[PDB]
Every structure is written in structure tokens, then in C-alpha cells.
Enzyme design. Sequence first.
Site: not given
Lengths: 245, 247, 247, 244, 247, 246
Positions: C68, C237, C141, C118, C73
Amino acid sequence: YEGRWKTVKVEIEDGIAFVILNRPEKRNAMSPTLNREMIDVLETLEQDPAAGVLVLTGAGEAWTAGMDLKEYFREVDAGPEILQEKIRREASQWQWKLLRMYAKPTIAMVNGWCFGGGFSPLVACDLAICADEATFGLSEINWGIPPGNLVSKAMADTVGHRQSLYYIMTGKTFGGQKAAEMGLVNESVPLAQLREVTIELARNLLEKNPVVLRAAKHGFKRCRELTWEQNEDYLYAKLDQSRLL
Amino acid sequence: YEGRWKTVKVEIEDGIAFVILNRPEKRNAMSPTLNREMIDVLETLEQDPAAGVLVLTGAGEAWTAGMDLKEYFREVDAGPEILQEKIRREASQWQWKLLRMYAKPTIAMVNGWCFGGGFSPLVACDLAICADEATFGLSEINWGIPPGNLVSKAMADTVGHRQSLYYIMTGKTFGGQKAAEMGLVNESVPLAQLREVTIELARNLLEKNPVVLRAAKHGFKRCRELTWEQNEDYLYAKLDQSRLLDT
Amino acid sequence: TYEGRWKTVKVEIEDGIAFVILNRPEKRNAMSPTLNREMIDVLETLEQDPAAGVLVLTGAGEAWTAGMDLKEYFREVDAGPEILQEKIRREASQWQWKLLRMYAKPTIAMVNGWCFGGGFSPLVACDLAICADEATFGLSEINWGIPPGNLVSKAMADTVGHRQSLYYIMTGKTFGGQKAAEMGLVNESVPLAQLREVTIELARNLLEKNPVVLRAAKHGFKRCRELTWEQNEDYLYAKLDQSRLLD
Amino acid sequence: GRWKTVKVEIEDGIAFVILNRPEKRNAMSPTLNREMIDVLETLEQDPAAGVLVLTGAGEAWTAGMDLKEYFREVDAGPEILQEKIRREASQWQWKLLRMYAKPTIAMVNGWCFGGGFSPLVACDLAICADEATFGLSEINWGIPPGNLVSKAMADTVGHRQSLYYIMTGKTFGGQKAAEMGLVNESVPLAQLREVTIELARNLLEKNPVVLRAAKHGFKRCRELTWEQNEDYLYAKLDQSRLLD
Amino acid sequence: TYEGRWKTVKVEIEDGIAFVILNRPEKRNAMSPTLNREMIDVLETLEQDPAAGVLVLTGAGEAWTAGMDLKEYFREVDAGPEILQEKIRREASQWQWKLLRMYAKPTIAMVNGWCFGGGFSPLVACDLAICADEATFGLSEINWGIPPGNLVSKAMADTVGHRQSLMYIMTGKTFGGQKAAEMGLVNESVPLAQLREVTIELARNLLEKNPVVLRAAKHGFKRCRELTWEQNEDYLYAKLDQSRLLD
Amino acid sequence: YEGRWKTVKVEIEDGIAFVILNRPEKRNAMSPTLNREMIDVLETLEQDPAAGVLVLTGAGEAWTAGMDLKEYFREVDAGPEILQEKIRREASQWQWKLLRMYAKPTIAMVNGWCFGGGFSPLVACDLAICADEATFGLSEINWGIPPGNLVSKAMADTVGHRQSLYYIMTGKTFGGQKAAEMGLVNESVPLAQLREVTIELARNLLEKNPVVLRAAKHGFKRCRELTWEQNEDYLYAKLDQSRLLD
């Protein structure tokens, strides 16, 4: 904590709380008394600012031989049917209900024998390091009972499907290197290096922010149970909760 | 059990029931007839106290090449639509509905070819030992069909995510040693020792209390599906159920 | 046509193989809100492009992706109203796994270098993955005082053992390609020099399959992990029959 | 004359399946279970049966498990026999019935107790008589609800009401069964057959394969998240298109 | 302005209440592929519009929506590539429930008339719903030879009892607004003449609440239905703390 | 049990243990102290052969007005960060972790105000009977709090999807008749008949074999979470377990 409990010792240094099962004459078998003391140990250490990481280990040769059969049958037979409810709840309370999602990071330091009921707190502990010379076994089958409490779930969470069924059905023993290869623990090392290696790991965890480490480790254990779409919501809520706290 | 079924053989030796898929000319492909006979075999052996462990194996060079979609698309195409529902039900009935939670311990003894639909009973069997020489494959995809029945779940339960998707998507074959490495089976050994090694394991299982063994193996397969709090309830119920039924 | 179409991503298609190249190499292909909106457009566009039969997700420069772009951000988040965060997280999930995990075409992550944080969500959303021995992975992180965000922890849960995942998440320690492959995070690790060749060989094999059948097989496998055997009898199925319809 | 404990009377595509041990209030014995398996497998493949209506001979729908007969067979043998007897009970009561290829209607003419709840809820739809009495008497006989009774209650009746009837063992009538959602409708007994046939005829109008997809899809969707159901329900839609 | 922005939908805001009006009254607001794409844009846009605090979804003319525009859907799927069906189904789910069910703002369905088939999915995705007594509902899919598509069966599962859901799904019979409220499909049924007033009262009540808190509450409830009590202890306290952080 | 606890009283009559939340001046708001005492109360009564059925009720006007948020914030503000973990655990421990799968039958007798956090033990109790005059509400939302602890799940388990969202989102109140109509409780009766009606029900439950009743009610609550095939295994195990322990 010196002399506080009959069946458990706690020794804390440098933020590392060693919790030591202490019934070495009986391979640290888990009796109803041990279960009640361990609940008190976990609750007490939770609120102790000197404790940043817990390491669960055994006095003497064993980690734990598992359930104390004599002591369980002693207590259970001396009461009404409903005493069994309480005894089983006490076992679960420290072995995983408090331990699996414990607020602080936890390491199992498996120094020797780890059998049967010992697998529940082994897996409830976040990480685990064992001695090569340790011996593990799900001997319940050979004693004529299936694995009790959360033992089968402990195996399901950590060890592959075929291997888990082989050890459960046969009751065969395996050593530390095999435990690590199967994923039951993180690593196995010679007993002589076990404490040093465990302490280096504990120090690493101590460098992390405890509220963040808690969010990370709880989030992982819980996300295994949820779909991707559920975890989008859950995992971002855990992230936001850690930012708050 | 001599000559009792057309497509399968049961031979019991000293508590160990060898159940032998027996269409070697068609590499033991699972036709609707074989599915019906296997239902009958499992229901029969469940109630026969001479049988303490079941070992599932194939006659000839194959374990099983998978569904006989030939004979399947024979019966189906020249029958009403609803016949397909019966044929699929019969396939699941022996392959995992009865087998996965079978009352006796089960071992797949994979002597050779194991393809496609054979993965369902392979994983429904509690334990599995294969020959190094055995060849596995989900060749479905190379024939233009995705894995049918419970095949993809059998892989999901035993083999990791990446490796399952690799084999399902590419349809590439792999040998016994790879099957053991991936976790699809417990162990791979030379074909020359496959029977001895299997019999050793079966003897270990034969000695256990069957009701207790049943509680242990069922409880494990089920507890994979449940949370720890659910399992506290379920596993103690299986323990108590074992005590009752054992006595 | 794709030349110069997107700021932060490039798409190069040859022989049915669409290379999707994250392209912010000065920021180690960190995933900013601009890149997330572009990657949504890339995936929607490639879905309907008949020249693309398989997608290969890879990074320009030394990185696959550093994760990230938390700077970019928080920059925008701090700036704008509370709800902007909702849109930025929505757009990140939209491409990283909501479109990608069950994408209509086969996908391979080709991890040429750094893969942090990320990055793990699209890494595991991609069906298959091949990485360079030289690639470095980490869930950094925790050392930045945040737990894994978006679907990173689920990505690890789906592919890597319980103990190993907890170890890397809790410690934030890095590991290389060979270790990523040993752990199951990717299918295979090879030297960077061989990475493109190996990836292209795999992509060619996937291209030989009927896309509708491949889609059924791959989606069916991912979803079946979440269902019980009995649920999967119905679901699998239904995927088989759906495939046979769609052709 | 095919079965000891069950009658099948088909009329205009409607197969009435009549539990037929009226002397015993159609108590479900191991014999009845084994015969009910054969009934469902047989009617599935019978082109003359388009909808099944499950009902009882005499005054009862079913009084539930036949405990005498069960113990009889169970005491006559080894522990493993119980495994077989329980499987046979589940096989017709819900394993075949809940996701049956054809539509099913429970026509509850009278007494419905205990173990009768599982096939009651396994049938897609249910119409009962006002005069019908229902009850989960297990508790008054010292056993909890066996087989799938508790799940059958969970699927159809609210949490509080289910726990109330399970814990107390109190009886309730047809109008109350309809109010709590255990059945679709309750009507006087004199009109029961006529209302059931009208419903059955409505179902017979539909394409069987589409109806099957719809019925099964709904039952299964309850168990799945919205994201899982996107996949599953469109797969059922496409399977229906294929099978016709 | 949103005036004339979309072909098939109109949006008008009345002091915080964003009325979103499906607008193909000549087709009883049947949901076409164009309408699905436009609704996605509407929801995304309104999420970020600070003038919009609560969304009210309603229909132009006599209908709320007659459901899927099957004619147009089949037209486009027949003329387009095979993979176009994937895209169209994805876009229908995208606005009907993927964005709408856990929408960042409170949502109310104002069901002014005909609500059939496919309209049940967004009906239930909306948090609350009020309908006219004069409105008619039905799942008449089955009468045209189609089982309920998209999330219709789950929308019924979530809101209407098991027996009643099956009855309407299997028979295709219609029911009116009062019966819709009695069964739990909607919150309340009122004469059409009072419908707008009652819906506005409800919307202005919701506008009293802190938006972030209301979002935590409603998302928390919808999610908690899927989780065990023990999972929910973790999840619901995390939603509470997240609400605190974000307001 | 006279005078044993500060915030709770227990009075046993002929097998029926009345457990009485006892902070009437605060409408029985659930403080950290009350949580700790209720855990002790539940653990104690489980092992007391004189108690066959538990009836959970409140002193004064209220059943419970919900969590004592004042006291909660005071303690969390003054204590270490980790104290919040403990307080939340202890609240859950009695409200549902012990209570929902309690070894004995439980009945909530809802004599008055039941708000917010109250909903968890209300639904953890097996059965519930309220006064017509009682008022219920999830008015959390008006204070700027979403429902905390298990309140939302207690709603999901008992009340329909639409009605639950309506009351959670709007914070509107409802009375006992409406509580019964929605499925939150089993029955609503005038307050003057509440105790009599509760006692009759409790007596019926006392007739049953405790071990069998426990198997029945636990089996029901757990079966809602499992598929039919899972339940074939689980429910037969609970049957067999009951026959063992009986």
C-alpha cells in the site's frame, strides 16, 4: 509469584513471563487443581504490566504428559454428574478459551514429553519451539478413548489431513524434528539451545506494539474461519480497532 | 464372498478385508454397475465382524482410471433426464457418503493409475499408501470437463491451495512420491513392498478398539468444519458417545 | 490500444498472454489510489479483450509491489472527508481480489522482486504464482505499527501453514523465493533469469484449455474449500453442468 | 401389494405415499424405514409420479419413532447394527427427501409427533388439518429430539417457540402449526385432500427440472453467504437451462 | 447537476434524502444491462456526495421494477462474446447487492408498485423497505421456465420464513403489500397515497443519527447473522471500536 | 445466599432460583462489579442441587437498563489499556458464554425496562416472559454507539431481519406485546400475572430429567449453526451423550 501456586511456577524477567507447569513427578499431568491454577495464572499475568510475552514450558523432563487420569477420576467420581461440566469447563478455560485469543503474545517452549491433552494449549499458544529430543504422541487411542477437549481441532489447525489422521488413529510417537516438519510447531532445536532460541524470539515480539501485535495475531486466527468477503469487513474492523487503541 | 459381484472382489485375510476393484480390462473405471456393487460391498462389510479394516485397491495395473463416462453417457443418453440423478447419487453413495465416515478404518492401497473420479474415494479412505510407480492425474480438464463429483474437495482437504490449482488447471500427471510430498497420500513405497507396508499399517489399526477408533477418525474429519467453540461441544459429545457405545 | 493508456500500469499482450505490469518503479510499484482505479479499468478491459487468454501480473523495475502506498493513502484521507476512506478501501479490494480471485480468465502472478504487505492479496487472488529465488517477501506492517490490512491475513491463511503464517505476521521478518515456494505461498521459485520463460510455458499450457471449462474448474476449487462435502455435491455438479451449458 | 408398511396410490401424476401401520399410529419402525427408502428411489424413476404427497393411514400422520421395534432390532445384535438402523432412518426421512428430485407436500391428516418432524420439514411444502395434533414428546419420555428433529424445528419455527415446545413437550394444533411456520396452511380435515390436490396440481404445471432447481437452490442458499450464493445460484440457473 | 445525467435512472436530493428513481416506466423499470451500469455509477457517486445522507430507491410510473429485462439481456448475450454474460451478471450483482447490501449510507426501498423476480435482490439489499398496499409482488420466474436468478432466493431466505418462501418460489403466485409486510419482506405497508410521507418520516429519523455509527450498526447486524456468538464477540466489538475511531 | 453479593440477590423457592439484578437506583445497569458477581452467581448455582431452574429478573421498575456506561468509562479511562479486555470478557462471561449453554434451564422474567446490553442475557436465557407494561429499546444509536457485545446477534437469533434493522437503526422503543409478537420473548402477560405465569412454566421444566433437558436445549441452539448432514452427527452424539450421563 514465588510460592503462589501449588502446581505452576511463574518467573518473569525482561518482560518474558515463563509459565512453568510444575508437577514433575507426574510429568506435569494436568489435574483439576492445575487447571484452576492456570486460569488464575493467565488472568493475573494479563493485568501484570511487567509481563509482555508468555512462554509456556514444563518442569523437569516433560512439557506435559496430558490429562491426569487419577486426579480427574478422583474429583469426578466424588461428585454429582454436574461436577464433570465444571471440570471440563476449567480445562478449556485456560487451555484455549483464554489462551488462544490471549491479549499478549504466547510461545510454547516444548522441552520434553508432550502427549494427549497437551496438544490443546500447544496450539492455542501463538508460536511454538520444541527440543529435537522431545517426544509427542496422541496416545488416547491406545488408552481406549478418542482425543478429548480440543486436541483433534489443535491437530486440524496445524497438521495436514493425512498426517493428523495417521497420528490420531495409530497413536504413534514422533520427535521434535518431525513435529516441526508437520507444522505442529515453528521449529525444533537441540534442547541445549531451546531456551536461548525461545528468548531471541520473545525479544523480537517484545519490540512490537502490543495492541497492534494482538490485532494481527487475533485477526489471523479468526480469518481462517471467514470467507474473503466476510474478512474484508472483519480485517478492516481489526485494523481500525488497533488504530483506536 | 467368492464370485458374489461382477466388478469387485472381496478377500478377507485375518481381519483385513481387501476390496479389489475388478474391471482390469477397463483399468477399473467406475461404471454404474460397479457403483451399485460397491454400495452393496460397503454395507455388507460394515456388518461382517470378520472385517476389522478395509483396504481399497485395484486389480491389474490400475487403481482406478476414474469414471466410466462412456458407460455413463450410454445409460444417460438413452434414458430419461432423471436417470442422471440416480447414477450420480449411486456414485457419491459409495465413493464418500458411506466411505468418508465409514464405521471401520479404511486404507487406500493405490497400486497404479489413479485418475479423475478416483480422487473422491482416495480421500474418503482414512489413510492411503501408494506405489512410487503409481500415476495420478486430474486429466478432466484436457477432456473439456471440470472435476466432477467431490474430486475438487478431495484435493482441497489434502493438498495445498497452490498445488491443487496447479494440478486441476493444467491436468498434468504426477507420481507416487509427489502424491506423498503434496499430502494426497500418507506414504509412497516401491510397488514390490506396497502390500507388506499396507498390511503392517492395517494391523496397527486392527488392534484398536473399533468404536473408539471410529469416534477418533470421524471427530477429526468433522472438527475441520467447526470453530473451536463448536468443537468443545461436538468433540466432548463424540467422547461421551464413544464411552456409551463401547460399553 | 494500450500504449500510454494508464499512468501507473502497462499492459503488453503477445500470443494470448496479457502481461499486466505495475509501473511506479520509483516507488517500488506501491499501490496508490490512482493505481487501484487504473487496475480496476485494466481488469474490466482485459476481461472483454479477445486477444487476452491468460493474465500475468508482474512489476516494473526491481519490485513486484512494495504494498500500500500508505503515504498517498493517508495524505488524501487526512485531507478529505471520512467517507473518502470507504471509497479508497473499496477500490483497493475491487481489483486486488473481488475481480481478481474469481476472474473469468486464468491468472498467474510472476513475482520478479519485492512483494510486501498489501501485495499479498492480489498475489494469492491470482490462481498460480511463480517467483524469482531473488524476490523478497515480508509482512512489514507490524514494524510500522499496523496489523495486516485488506485481505492480506486471509491470503496467508489460504496458502501458508498456521504456524508459519503467525510467525511472519507477528515478527515481520522477510523471506526469499525458495522459502515462499517451500511454504506454499507460490507454486515454484526459479532464478530471475528463468522466471519469464517458466511463466510463459505455464501460460501456454493454460491457453490449451477450453476457457469456460478452466473457469469452472478454478472457481469450483476456490469455492469448494468453503463448503462441506454435502454442500459440494450440489455445488460442484452444478459447476460441471454450468460448464457443459456454456460450452 | 408391494410394501408391508406403506401404500402408494398415484392419480393424475399425484403420488400419494401413505404410511400404513394405522394400528400403531404409523410409528416409524426399521421395517418402515427400509421400505420408505425403496418407495422414494422407486417413485423418483417412475414417469407416472410428478409430485409426492406424504400422508398417513387412519387417524395419524405418524406418532414418530417405533421404539419397541427399534430396540427389538437393536437388542438382537452388535453395536454396529445401530449405525445401520440410524442411517436407514435418515436416508428416507431427509437425505433423499429434503433434496428430492420431485416436489413433495406433507399432508398432515392427524397425529404428528417426535421423529415425524424430520420428514415433515424435509417435504417442500405442508398442509395440515386443523384437527391435527403435533408434539415433541421426546422430553417427557426422557430423551432429547433424535435424528434431525431439532434442525427441522430450527429451519421452520422461531427460536423461542422451538425451545418452548422442545423443552416443555406441550402439544399444539394445526392452526398453531401454521401460525408458527411449521406448515404452510391449516384447513379443516374435510377439505384437507382437496386443498392439497389443488396445490399439487399447481406444482404439476411447472417444468419439473426448473422446479427442482428452484426448490433445491432455496434450501441450499440458506446455508451460504450472499457472495457464495452468487456463484451457487447462477450455477443452479445454468444447470436448469442445460437439463431443460 | 444530476439532472439528465443518466438515461435509465434519475436522482433528486431533498435536504439529505437522495431519491433514486428507476426510470424506464414504459418497461415497468425492467433492469437492462444499461440500467445496471448506470446504477453502479449512481451508487458510487452518491456515496461520495456530502449532500446525500439517506438513499430512497423507488420506481418511475406504476412499477417499482418488473425485474430483469430478459428480452434485452438475451439480445446482448446472443450478439456479444460468451464472456459478455459474465460481465452483465457481474454488473447486475454490483449495484443490486454488492455495493448496496453493505452501503455506507442508510437505504430505504420505497416500493410504489410492481416488484417481481430480480427486483427482490435490491429490495432486500436496501436496509429498510416500505411498500404500498396496492403494490403486487411475485417470483413469477418459475412460470416462464426459469428458477430465481442472481440473489433472489437468498433475499427471500433472509426475510421470509422457510415454508412461505418455498410456497412463493415454487408456485410463482403473487401477493400484495399487506402480505409482504406480514411475511417480513418489507417493514411496513401503507396506502400508496401515504407512501412518500411515511418514507420521508423514516428517512428524516435516520438523518438524526451519526452516519458512521448508523453504518456500524446496520453492517454489524447483517454480518452477525452469518457468524457464531463467539465469532461475533470479536467482530461486533471490532465494529464498535471502528465506529469510535471514525466518529 | 442472603447478603452474599452487592449487586445481585438469589432467592430459591422449591427448586426455582430467582436471580435478581439489584441496582434499582440505576435501573439495574450492568457495572463491572455486577458482571463479576453474576459470574460467581452462575458458577455457584450450577453446582447447587437445590437450584433446578433459574429465573433472571430485576429489582424495582427495571429488568436492566443495559450496560452502566458511566462506570465502564470511568474504569477504562483510569485503568491500563488492557483492563478494557478484562471488563469486556467478564461482561460476556455471564451474559452469554456461561448463560446461553447453561447446564440448567433458564427463563428471563422481564418485569420492566430492558435496554441495550440487556438484550444479550435476555436471549441467552432459554425462554423469556415479559410484562405487557415492559419497555424495550436499542437506544444505543441515539447516544452515538452501535449495539455492543452480543446485542445484535441476540436480535438476529430471535427477531426478523427487517424488524431488527428497524429498531437498531431508529432506536425506537417497543412494549411487551410487540416483543412477544416479534419473537424476542415467548409471551407477554400483565405485570400482575408475570410471576405466576413464570413459576408455572418453571415448574413444568422442573418435571424433566435435567440431563435430557440440557441435551435438548443445547442441541437446539447448536443445530441452528450446522448443516443437516453435520447435525446428523452432532445430534446423535448429543443423544448418546445424554443416555450416558443420564
